[PDB]
Amino acid sequence: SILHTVNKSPFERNSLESCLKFATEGASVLLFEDGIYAALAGTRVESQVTEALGKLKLYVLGPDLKARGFSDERVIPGISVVDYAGFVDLTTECDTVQAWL
Amino acid sequence: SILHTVNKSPFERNSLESCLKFATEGASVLLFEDGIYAALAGTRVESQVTEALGKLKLYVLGPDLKARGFSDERVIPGISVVDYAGFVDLTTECDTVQAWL
Amino acid sequence: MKFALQINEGPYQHQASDSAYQFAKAALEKGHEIFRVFFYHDGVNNSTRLTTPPQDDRHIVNRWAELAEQYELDMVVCVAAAQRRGIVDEGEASRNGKDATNIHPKFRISGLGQLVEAAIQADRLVVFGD
Amino acid sequence: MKFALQINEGPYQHQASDSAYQFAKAALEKGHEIFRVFFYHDGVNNSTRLTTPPQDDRHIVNRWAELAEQYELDMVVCVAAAQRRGIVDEGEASRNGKDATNIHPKFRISGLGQLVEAAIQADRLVVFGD
Amino acid sequence: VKKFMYLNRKAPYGTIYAWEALEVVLIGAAFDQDVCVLFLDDGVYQLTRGQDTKGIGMKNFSPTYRTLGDYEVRRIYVDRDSLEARGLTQDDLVEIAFEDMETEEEFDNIVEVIDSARVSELMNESDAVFSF
Amino acid sequence: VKKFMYLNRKAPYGTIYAWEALEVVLIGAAFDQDVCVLFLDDGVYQLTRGQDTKGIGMKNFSPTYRTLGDYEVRRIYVDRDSLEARGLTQDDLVEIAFEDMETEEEFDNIVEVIDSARVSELMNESDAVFSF
């Protein structure tokens, strides 16, 4: 029941990899800011992200996605695109928020 | 004839990996600040660092090494330990300095 | 629900402050309470009134101040982190022998205990950093 | 040789400023010339006179100022980056309508062209950042 | 009443996060909440023994970690996988003592190395997580 | 006289490095030095097309990259390996025009994708490297 937040690029930092290792079945992960790049289909980390979809609920912040030049169709199928209001709902739906800086 | 500087942890950032990929035969690489951890024997990146010693001259800043709890004996054999004065000499001996942030 | 927001980075350098602002605004429009917005580390730099950012882009400090005015938010800046970085209000200027202040009047300088206190009172602690 | 030093991060938050200081001091003791020390990005925050860091640790701003006094260093702070972050000298305060200044008297606020200019004049450009 | 976790993941000195994070733990002590401090990834480097900072011109704040027990911190965890990835063993870390006059407990070291599953468990038990 | 390289390696918006780095390139134009701008690693993301920032409350500075040719910047390089690692192709990047009234050259796009060896070569030819 934890909402993990990842705001750093998976190609730049180890934040996303550590998150996916410790997040447990049923947990949610939100990619925002530079973390958005991990949600894009075709990258070198698509495999590990897709595998994560098997036990975690993944979300990506649409505003950051769009700001960086990507439409929702560019996301790995399964990752739900949310806006800031959705981000807020995720923090209240889950029991605790954990930031991976 | 380039002196590459790496100040970020190889476990935290991709800076060291990118540096080792683009540095050419004869170039020098200085690890300082958090980059110091890459010079330690026994880590998950020792293999790639040791391989680099085959074509590059590697240096590590002693002051940062000591500040983080490691003596010179903990370094991968081949990496020369230098102080700030040595850091300065490296920038003047080489033709250009390139920082990998 | 009640939120405690922590911002660890300075304005513009990192998107943290902007992300925190958009989150706060969205939460406030939903009727949720923001018990306190706490600035720590370089985050304390979001409280200076001396910025003159480009007019064609957002003014982070004034924007936070406008949000605080509209929703009556308690914006707190860590005194320890502020002393290290140069954020000064009237009290600090006198105690530290400075001839000027730079804090924005909508923010208040207080102890780190205000952060822990908020974490205890709020239902969720959302941290924005690097 | 002649050096141009660029510092991109604020004091304390990142070791950059400290590393740059130790490098500068070592270079200066060797007889090398430091043509200019340029602060950019959050680096401009190394020029405020309003810091009151713990007494049992180094005072980054004063330490840079002492080095500049001893070796007559040209310490320059980018005006664009300073306006965005709140570093203000007398001229800026008047032009930007601020009621106070916070720059340390040993530093000067100038254009980004001073950085490029130094890169052209110096033999080496050493950048310290994140 | 609440369970607070302090998640340390950055190496010391390169950034101020390690030191200012430690400051929060000391301050939080007076609130008597249930606290645990976890060192993961580069955060495990925050606990190395024998740090000497005279060469970098900074104050050595490492001694403060050894006083955590004095601030009622009984639960200090270190990720075993992170230690291994860095070629470190518990022998490379400082010991943190803990004593309680009331219960007579007197431990030379409470730093505990744990596996990944336990880490995930501790995360799931927390009501609030302080990140730096 | 000198050869200056601007090394861009960070993604835009998450940090200010992309924007303030671009500011230096524009300023450096007036010094008429030999300049090249290299986008490597996440820096290649700085050149994505179709950026829309209304949702994040920030000004979209992407248009500025397309004006680089107007500031005499003729050499703009993008690391091919970085593009591939991110599932991107040159079709995902903006075009940067270059025209010189004196020589009659009029190019629709001067952005050039290069291999790792060429990148290393460009680095070895530089007299100064601006990093951000």
From Swiss-Prot, chains C, D:
Positions annotated as active site in the UniProt record: 78 (cysteine persulfide intermediate)
**A Pfam family this chain is assigned to:** DsrE
| One GO process term, biological-process aspect | sulfur oxidation
Q: Which organism is it from?
A: Allochromatium vinosum (strain ATCC 17899 / DSM 180 / NBRC 103801 / NCIMB 10441 / D)
SUPFAM superfamilies per record? DsrEFH-like
Give the subcellular location. Cytoplasm
Query: Which residue windows are coiled coil?
Result: none
Could you tell me what this protein is called?
Putative sulfurtransferase DsrE
The gene for this chain is dsrE
State the source organism's domain of life. Bacteria
Where primarily located? cytoplasm
- State the protein's purpose: Not known. Could be involved in the oxidation of intracellular sulfur.
According to the UniProt entry, its GO molecular function terms are: sulfur carrier activity; sulfurtransferase activity
Keywords on record: Cytoplasm, Transferase
Report the EC code(s) recorded for this entry: 2.8.1.-
Q: Under which main EC class is this enzyme filed?
A: transferase
So which residues are the signal peptide here? none
Q: Say which family it is in.
A: Belongs to the DsrE/TusD family.
Query: What InterPro entries has UniProt attached to this entry?
Result: DsrEFH-like (IPR027396), Sulphur_relay_DsrE/F-like (IPR003787), Sulphur_relay_TusD/DsrE (IPR017463)
- GO cellular component annotations of the record: sulfurtransferase complex
Curated annotation (Swiss-Prot), chains E, F:
Job of this protein: Not known. Could be involved in the oxidation of intracellular sulfur.
Pfam families named in the record: DsrE (PF02635)
Query: Which organism's genome codes for this protein?
Result: Allochromatium vinosum (strain ATCC 17899 / DSM 180 / NBRC 103801 / NCIMB 10441 / D) (Chromatium vinosum)
* Record protein name field: Intracellular sulfur oxidation protein DsrF
Indicate the family of this protein: Belongs to the DsrF/TusC family.
